[PDB]
Amino acid sequence: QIITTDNTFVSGNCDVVIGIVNNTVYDPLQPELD
Amino acid sequence: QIITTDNTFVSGNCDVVIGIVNNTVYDPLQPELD
Ligand SMILES: *[C@@H]1O[C@H](CO)[C@@H](O)[C@H](O)[C@H]1NC(C)=O
Ligand SMILES: *[C@@H]1O[C@H](CO)[C@@H](O)[C@H](O)[C@H]1NC(C)=O
Ligand SMILES: *[C@@H]1O[C@H](CO)[C@@H](O)[C@H](O)[C@H]1NC(C)=O
Ligand SMILES: *[C@@H]1O[C@H](CO)[C@@H](O)[C@H](O)[C@H]1NC(C)=O
């Protein structure tokens, strides 16, 4: 599945996790902000 | 963590639960209403 704000959760900034990768996390809400 | 509508679910009106407390529940939709 696509990485989204629904199938994931945040905790803290990117500095502490020993292996971490840059990728987009999609948000389904803001594409219809109006 | 901040008590949002994503951390929680609703059921009844407040009168039935013994020991319930009054507090705000945050909604992360509210800033996105452009
Ligand atoms: C994983 O292994 C490779 C090859 O030994 C190494 O270059 C890399 O730094 C390791 N990654 C982590 C997160 O330690
Ligand atoms: C990940 O993204 C941040 C912010 O652009 C950048 O500082 C960092 O160097 C990037 N790391 C890699 C491996 O792309
Ligand atoms: C908890 O105990 C105190 C002391 O007896 C009492 O005043 C209070 O009403 C009780 N709270 C609940 C939620 O029953
Ligand atoms: C809780 O909030 C309601 C609505 O403002 C109020 O009627 C009730 O008296 C409050 N109870 C307490 C214990 O603050």
Q: What amino acid is encoded at B22 in this protein?
A: N
CA dist A32 and A18 (Å) reads 35
Q: Is A33 on the interface with B (CB under 8 A)?
A: yes
Question: How many Cβ atoms from other residues are within 10 Å of residue B33's Cβ?
Answer: 7
Q: Within 13 A of B31's CA, how many CA atoms are on the CB side? A: 2
Q: Which residues of B touch A27 (CB under 8 A)?
A: none
Q: How was this structure determined?
A: cryo-EM
Count how many residues are written for chain B: 34
Nearest-Cα residue of chain B relative to residue A27: B32
Backbone angles phi, psi at A6, to 5 degrees: -90, -45
